[PDB]
Amino acid sequence: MEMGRRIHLELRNRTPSDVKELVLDNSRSNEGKLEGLTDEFEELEFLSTINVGLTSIANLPKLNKLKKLELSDNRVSGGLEVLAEKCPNLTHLNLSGNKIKDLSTIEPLKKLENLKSLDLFNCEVTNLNDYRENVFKLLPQLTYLDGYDRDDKEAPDS
Amino acid sequence: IKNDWLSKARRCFITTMDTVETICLRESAKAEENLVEKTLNEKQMWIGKK
Amino acid sequence: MSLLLTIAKEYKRLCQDAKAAQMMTVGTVSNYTTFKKWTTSRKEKNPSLRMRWAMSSKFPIIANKRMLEEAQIPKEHNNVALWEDTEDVSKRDHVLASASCINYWNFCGPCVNNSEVIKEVYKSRFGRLERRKEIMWKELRFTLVDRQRRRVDTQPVEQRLRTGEIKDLQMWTLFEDEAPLASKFILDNYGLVKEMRSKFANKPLNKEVVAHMLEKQFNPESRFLPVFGAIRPERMELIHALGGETWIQEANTAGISNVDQRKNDIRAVCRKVCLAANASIMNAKSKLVEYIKSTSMRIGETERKLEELILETDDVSPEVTLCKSALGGQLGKTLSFGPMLLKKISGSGVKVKDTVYIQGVRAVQFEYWSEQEEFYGEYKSATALFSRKERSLEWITIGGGINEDRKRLLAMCMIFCRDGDYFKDAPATITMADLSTKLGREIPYQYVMMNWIQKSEDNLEALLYSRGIVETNPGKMGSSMGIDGSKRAIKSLRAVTIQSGKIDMPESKEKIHLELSDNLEAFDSSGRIVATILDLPSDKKVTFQDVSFQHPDLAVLRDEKTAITKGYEALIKRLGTGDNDIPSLIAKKDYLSLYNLPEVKLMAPLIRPNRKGVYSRVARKLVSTQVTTGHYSLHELIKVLPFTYFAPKQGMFEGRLFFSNDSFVEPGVNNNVFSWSKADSSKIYCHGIAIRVPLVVGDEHMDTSLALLEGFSVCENDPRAPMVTRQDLIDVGFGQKVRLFVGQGSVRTFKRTASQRAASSDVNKNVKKIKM
Amino acid sequence: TQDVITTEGLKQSENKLPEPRSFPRWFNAEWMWAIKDSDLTGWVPMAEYPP
């Protein structure tokens, strides 16, 4: 459909200030750009944008209470420093299915001191040599990677 | 009209080329071989009396 | 926005006038078309001279004003005039300008985000370029090419449609808010509309241009041209650069945009159904219609119904002609006689019976026309222009290129006209066993002789010998044909002229209705037999790919997969509107009811009893998650509801949900047993069988205005019900009335209850009763 | 003949040479992957061992 109508539909007369969860999967976003989001969303604690032909992160407003994000199936590449200012209280992030080439694009995530788990699957970076270890050495605060901690410790359900 | 057409006198090239290649392709087909240079150099065309 | 207010103020000003008010008030909207002509009427005798004269002027292009100001295009970049404030007399909303402006705009003007959309707009021309890039040119030669003037098609096109069907495609892919009431075609072919819609939605484009280009996209350009060699659209589009009357540019173009294999497959399928439906002597016709309707085939990505394809096609072949007759399609004025083609240029006649003794004394009646009659003919790589007269072949002029084909054409033509002594006194060899009733149906004499000639060459030689042989007079040696189809000989067949160069094919843009008999004999408003079942290959075995013969008799699968497919059809049959159904229950979040539906109870025995409980727990769980949140995948629900009959138990879930027949379904990934795609969300592929899902409720992928159209229907007008938006249709309750603007100048009333029964069946049944 | 040649403009078949190329930057990655141990084993067959 379209993020505008999809959102207006999910919001069954509810103000954009009392929700704790939101979903936008299987929609489309013009120019691969977010459209309709603002800082009004304060109580938001979860977000999911999947298979929406997305390619960048520029119109993302400031969200503090956000603590979990999902951007799978899109083609994002390069923009990963906004997270240190908009969602500094973020813990879980996932990017499997996006365009990621090198590690320099990942470095900014070090500033997310609240980061706990990260998920990188099917990306070009994964096809390198000794990559789990180099990432772990870059982001020490991290413990879980793609659902697996150092020593291949499977993470619990939730 | 005379202006527009004179400014388009370049048409003669088309007609002359068509006639010449209408003679050369026809002469070349009767023999199933590339006979254009020979036709151009050799074929004699009566052009007057003297 | 404010623009809306501007439109309303303009309408108000228009209505304040008196004349405009009259013309708007009276009549319907169609008058617009009329008004569209009385305005902007001006032509020019010699356009070339006018354009050249105009271009000299300082400002030969009218242009928009506000767009130029917005784009910061000044009058003069650098001592070069571009435009000057003025108003074009006719438009009154434009300003003169010069051509130089375009160059400036082209080199430093406003740039759009992406212009790759043009590749979709002109897909035909980019296809032309892509095809041209794959042609390996070999070598120019010179020779007198033999060209035959025949009708052909000059554009490779997929899914060729009619003008009526296409018009909805433009409206339903660009202007949905003003789409007319849903037609049969749009409902049937919804994958194509979705595919076109996605490319041209939320885009800055001139909509009219795209619509016109889709019109050309779906139009196979038919032309009457001279032709040489094979006949394929891939060549005819550039024939001008392959050969003329005196030269030939050899080139291999076989493997580009294959369009002949699908025509071949369609004809093979028509042959198969025509040969199947000959078993029922009393009701062959009805069986044929049912057989055609319950069959489909895949074209590229989409799956299309065979009935529509037959209507669209233009294959003038005996197989297709009969099928087109049964459905009621009108067809060309083209006869057939075995694997031969004919076309009556002139003449007339009337049936006249004559006896033929098969062996000793055995009278067999055969009918022969009685008048002069000219006929073009066409056998493989050969052609003719023969004529008959009162049971005699007056003459035949052939212009083919092969001896064998020439002989076969001559023989089948002689048979066509029932000339020769053999028709008077049958050959000794032919017997009464083969004369008739191979399967209880009489076979006239001519088709007996045709089979005789095919059986053995010696019979053919005898038949040709039956036609008198004379001595080749001087000069006529070249225009003579021996028994071996020689160009010249010392003795030759009587009145059999021969020439070089194919006889030009006639042409006629006529459409004749033709019925068919109980024995599949196609009459055409007169005695003529255009086609029959006794002019088709005897039989052959073929493995058809990407086809759907969803009919019991025409099936090879066993009772197990058929039972599962039937169960899934039944489960999809409860997806219709009305209370106590899947969509309504989902709206009421009553997932519990789904577990006790009748069709799941019927389908439960199949489920593997050893681990029925464990599977039941997983599928009973997933539905709730889908149901409660409001984010669900209808296809997964249908796939996993059969397992929700039994009581949950405890156990480990490996990943696959088996049946009792060693066939499983994995929850999420498409497999042979159950498949689908997000592109065409209106098909379910169960063991390679297409099950159409009705369009009564949208899904996250399929969600759009179309996925609900079937649910709605028209009803008696009630002015109390509300007037809603097109988008709000999703939210209306089942069995709730609502008024709605439709198309242009139509306000109707729609009730969300699906009532579209089969019309053909009821009419047929009622009409049959009239004959008792 | 000579006229045939002059007509077709036949000339010896020029022998082309392979164009030179630069340093492969991806051989290293391929090599490193080759040094990895895959999930599956025993692709190659071998004979037996006598007494």
> What b-and-e string marks burial along C536-573, b requiring 16 or more CB atoms within 10 Å of the CB?
beeeeeeeeeebbbeeeeeeeeeeebebbbbbbbebbe
C403-416 helix and C445-455 helix, angle to the nearest 10 degrees: 160
| Closest residue in B to C46 (Cα–Cα) | B1
Beta carbons within 8 Å of C415's beta carbon, 6+ residues apart: C337, C446, C449, C450, C453, C463
Residue whose pair of structure tokens reads 């004394």 in the numeric block:
C361
Judge whether A139 is closer than 8 Å to chain C, CB to CB.
Answer: no
Give the number of residues written for chain A. 158
- What totals of helices (H) and strands (E) does chain C contain, helices first? 29, 26
What sign for the dihedral angle of Cα C588, C589, C590, C591?
Answer: positive
Cα C141 to its chain centre, rounded Å, is: 39
What distance in Å separates the CA atoms of residue C277 and residue B19, rounded to the nearest whole number?
62
Tokens coding B24: 């050369």
CA angle B29, B35, B36 (to 5 degrees): 110
**C26 residue type, one letter:** V
| Separation in Å, CA of A151 to nearest CA in chain D | 18
Touching D: A residues 32-71, CB under 8 Å? none
Q: Do D8 and B38 touch (CB under 8 A)?
A: no
Contact C381, C345 (CB under 8 A): no
Tokens coding D49: 């061992």
| Separation in Å, CA of B12 to nearest CA in chain D | 28
Q: C173, exposed or middle or buried, with CB in 10 Å at 0-12, 13-18, 19+?
A: buried
What distance in Å separates the CA atoms of residue C709 and residue C696, rounded to the nearest whole number?
7
In SS3 terms, chain A reads as CCHHHHHHHHCCCCCCCCCCCCCCCCCCCHHHCCCCCCCCCCCCCCCCCCCCCCCCCCCCCCCCCCCECCCCCCCCCCCCCCHHHHCCCCCEEECCCCCCCCCCCCHHHHHCCCCCEEECCCCHHHHCCCHHHHHHHHCCCCCEECCEECCCEECCCC
Neighboring chain D residues of B38 at a CB cutoff of 8 Å: 3
Q: C320, C374, C364: which is closest to C344 by C-alpha?
A: C374
Cα C465 to its chain centre, rounded Å, is: 47
What distance in Å separates the CA atoms of residue C250 and residue C139, rounded to the nearest whole number?
6
Cα C191 to its chain centre, rounded Å, is: 15
Contact C38, C68 (CB under 8 A): no
Contact C373, C345 (CB under 8 A): no
Judge whether C631 is closer than 8 Å to chain A, CB to CB.
Answer: yes
C318-327 helix and C284-293 helix, angle to the nearest 10 degrees: 90
What distance in Å separates the CA atoms of residue C361 and residue C124, rounded to the nearest whole number?
66
The answer to whether C and D touch (≥3 CB pairs < 8 Å) is no
Tokens coding C39: 């305005």
What distance in Å separates the CA atoms of residue C596 and residue C476, rounded to the nearest whole number?
89
Q: Is C568 helix (H, G, I), strand (E, B) or coil?
A: helix
Q: C294, C236, C279: which is closest to C439 by C-alpha?
A: C279
Phi, psi of C350 (to 5 degrees): -165, 140
What distance in Å separates the CA atoms of residue A69 and residue A48, rounded to the nearest whole number?
6
Give kind and range of the element (H or E) at residue C37. Answer: helix C31-38
Neighbours of chain D (3+ CB pairs under 8 A): A, B
C-beta contacts of C558-567 below 8 A and 24+ residues apart: C560/C661, C560/C663, C561/C661, C561/C663, C561/C686, C561/C687, C563/C606, C564/C606, C564/C659, C564/C661, C564/C663, C564/C673, C564/C686, C564/C687, C565/C686, C565/C687, C565/C689, C565/C691, C567/C599, C567/C602, C567/C603, C567/C606, C567/C642
DSSP, residue by residue, C480-502: ---TT--SS-SEEETTEEE-SSP
Phi, psi of C664 (to 5 degrees): -120, 175
| Closest residue in A to D34 (Cα–Cα) | A129
Q: By 3-state DSSP, what share of chain B in percent is helix, strand and coil, each rounded to 5?
A: 65, 0, 35
CA angle C359, C363, C369 (to 5 degrees): 115
What distance in Å separates the CA atoms of residue C99 and residue C55, rounded to the nearest whole number?
9
What distance in Å separates the CA atoms of residue C651 and residue C617, rounded to the nearest whole number?
9
**C580 residue type, one letter:** N
Tokens coding B15: 């007609």
Alpha carbon distances (Å) from B6 to B12, B27, C565: 11, 34, 78
Q: C705, C699, C657, C653: which is closest to C678 by C-alpha?
A: C699
Q: How many CB atoms lie within 10 A of CB C479?
A: 17
Report the half-sphere exposure of C293 (CA within 13 A, side-chain side). 11
In chain C, domain spans: 134-160+221-255, 161-220, 256-333, 334-501, 556-699, 700-755
Beta carbons within 8 Å of A58's beta carbon, 6+ residues apart: A33, A34, A79
Report the half-sphere exposure of A61 (CA within 13 A, side-chain side). 14
Tokens coding C348: 């007339």
What distance in Å separates the CA atoms of residue C179 and residue C172, rounded to the nearest whole number?
6
What distance in Å separates the CA atoms of residue B12 and residue B21, rounded to the nearest whole number?
14
What distance in Å separates the CA atoms of residue C492 and residue D26, rounded to the nearest whole number?
77
Judge whether C726 is closer than 8 Å to chain A, CB to CB.
Answer: no
Phi, psi of A90 (to 5 degrees): -85, 145
Alpha helices for C328-476 (secondary structure H) = 403-416, 421-424, 432-435, 445-455, 457-466
Tokens coding C122: 């002109």
Tokens coding C663: 């066939």
Alpha carbon distances (Å) from C759 to C164, C188, C522, C763, C766: 21, 16, 25, 6, 11
Distance in Å from the first CA to the final CA of chain A:
31
Give kind and range of the element (H or E) at residue C394. Answer: strand C393-398
Alpha helices for C303-426 (secondary structure H) = 306-312, 318-327, 403-416, 421-424
What distance in Å separates the CA atoms of residue C47 and residue B4, rounded to the nearest whole number?
12
What distance in Å separates the CA atoms of residue B10 and residue B16, rounded to the nearest whole number?
11
- DSSP annotation of C659 reads B
Strand extents, DSSP E, C60-135: 61-63, 95-97
Judge whether C590 is closer than 8 Å to chain A, CB to CB.
Answer: no
C-beta contacts of C229-235 below 8 A and 24+ residues apart: C231/C150, C231/C152, C232/C259, C232/C260, C233/C152, C233/C153, C233/C154, C233/C155, C233/C156, C233/C157, C233/C257, C233/C259, C234/C131, C234/C156, C234/C259
Interface mutation target, options A102, A129, A134, chain D, most CBs of D under 10 Å: A129
Tokens coding A47: 């977000």
What distance in Å separates the CA atoms of residue C748 and residue C715, rounded to the nearest whole number?
8
What distance in Å separates the CA atoms of residue C476 and residue C260, rounded to the nearest whole number?
42
Q: B31, C139, C243, C251: which is closest to D8 by C-alpha?
A: C139
Give kind and range of the element (H or E) at residue C738. Answer: strand C737-742
Give kind and range of the element (H or E) at residue C215. Answer: helix C207-217
Strand extents, DSSP E, C39-85: 61-63
- DSSP annotation of D16 reads P
Tokens coding B37: 């240079």
Q: How many CB pairs under 8 A join B and D?
A: 5
Strand extents, DSSP E, C179-269: 222-227, 247-252
What distance in Å separates the CA atoms of residue C320 and residue C531, rounded to the nearest whole number?
10
Contact C742, C748 (CB under 8 A): yes
**B9 residue type, one letter:** A
Alpha carbon distances (Å) from C609 to C49, C616, C642, C656: 88, 11, 13, 14
- DSSP annotation of C724 reads -
What distance in Å separates the CA atoms of residue C172 and residue C180, rounded to the nearest whole number?
9
Q: A56, exposed or middle or buried, with CB in 10 Å at 0-12, 13-18, 19+?
A: middle
What sign for the dihedral angle of Cα D8, D14, D15, D19?
Answer: negative
Q: Strand A144-145 relative to strand A117-119: parallel, antiparallel, unpaired?
A: parallel
C260-276 helix and C284-293 helix, angle to the nearest 10 degrees: 140
The four Cα atoms C7, C13, C16, C17 give a dihedral, to 10 degrees, of: -110
What sign for the dihedral angle of Cα C520, C523, C527, C531?
Answer: negative
Contact C253, C234 (CB under 8 A): yes
Q: A40, A78, A88, A28: which is closest to A58 by C-alpha?
A: A78
Tokens coding C88: 């074009």
- DSSP annotation of C580 reads S
Q: Strand C341-344 relative to strand C352-357: parallel, antiparallel, unpaired?
A: unpaired
Give the number of residues written for chain C. 772
What sign for the dihedral angle of Cα C758, C760, C766, C769?
Answer: negative
Compute and round to an integer the Cα radius of gyration of chain D. Answer: 27
Report the half-sphere exposure of A27 (CA within 13 A, side-chain side). 23
**C645 residue type, one letter:** Y
- DSSP annotation of C417 reads T
Q: How many CB atoms lie within 10 A of CB C420?
A: 20
The answer to whether C and B touch (≥3 CB pairs < 8 Å) is yes
CA angle C475, C480, C484 (to 5 degrees): 140
Report the half-sphere exposure of D22 (CA within 13 A, side-chain side). 2
Beta bridge partners of C425: C357
Beta carbons within 8 Å of C13's beta carbon, 6+ residues apart: none
Q: Do B33 and C142 touch (CB under 8 A)?
A: yes
Contact C157, C123 (CB under 8 A): no
Beta bridge partners of C497: C397
Would you put residue C239 in left (φ > 0), alpha (ψ -120 to 50) or beta? alpha
Q: How many CB pairs under 8 A join A and C?
A: 13
What distance in Å separates the CA atoms of residue C51 and residue A142, rounded to the nearest whole number?
73
Tokens coding C385: 């222009």
Q: By 3-state DSSP, what share of chain D in percent is helix, strand and coil, each rounded to 5?
A: 30, 0, 70
What distance in Å separates the CA atoms of residue A87 and residue B46, rounded to the nearest whole number?
95
Contact C369, C350 (CB under 8 A): yes
Q: C47, C40, C51: which is closest to C89 by C-alpha?
A: C40
The four Cα atoms C72, C76, C80, C81 give a dihedral, to 10 degrees, of: 90
Alpha carbon distances (Å) from C708 to A1, C195, C305, C752: 14, 17, 22, 9
Tokens coding C237: 């589009």
Cα C111 to its chain centre, rounded Å, is: 40
DSSP, residue by residue, C244-296: -SSEEEEEE-TTSS--HHHHHHHHHHHHHHHHHTTS-STTHHHHHHHHHHT-E
| Chain B positions with Cβ closer than 8 Å to C | 1, 4, 25-26, 28-30, 32-34
| Closest residue in B to D9 (Cα–Cα) | B34
Neighboring chain B residues of C44 at a CB cutoff of 8 Å: none
Q: How many CB atoms lie within 10 A of CB C268?
A: 16
Tokens coding C311: 């209507």
Q: How many CB atoms lie within 10 A of CB A100?
A: 21
In SS3 terms, C3-15 reads as HHHHHHHHHHHHH
**C278 residue type, one letter:** N
Alpha carbon distances (Å) from C437 to C283, C353, C432: 18, 20, 9
Q: How many CB atoms lie within 10 A of CB A115?
A: 20
Judge whether A2 is closer than 8 Å to chain C, CB to CB.
Answer: yes
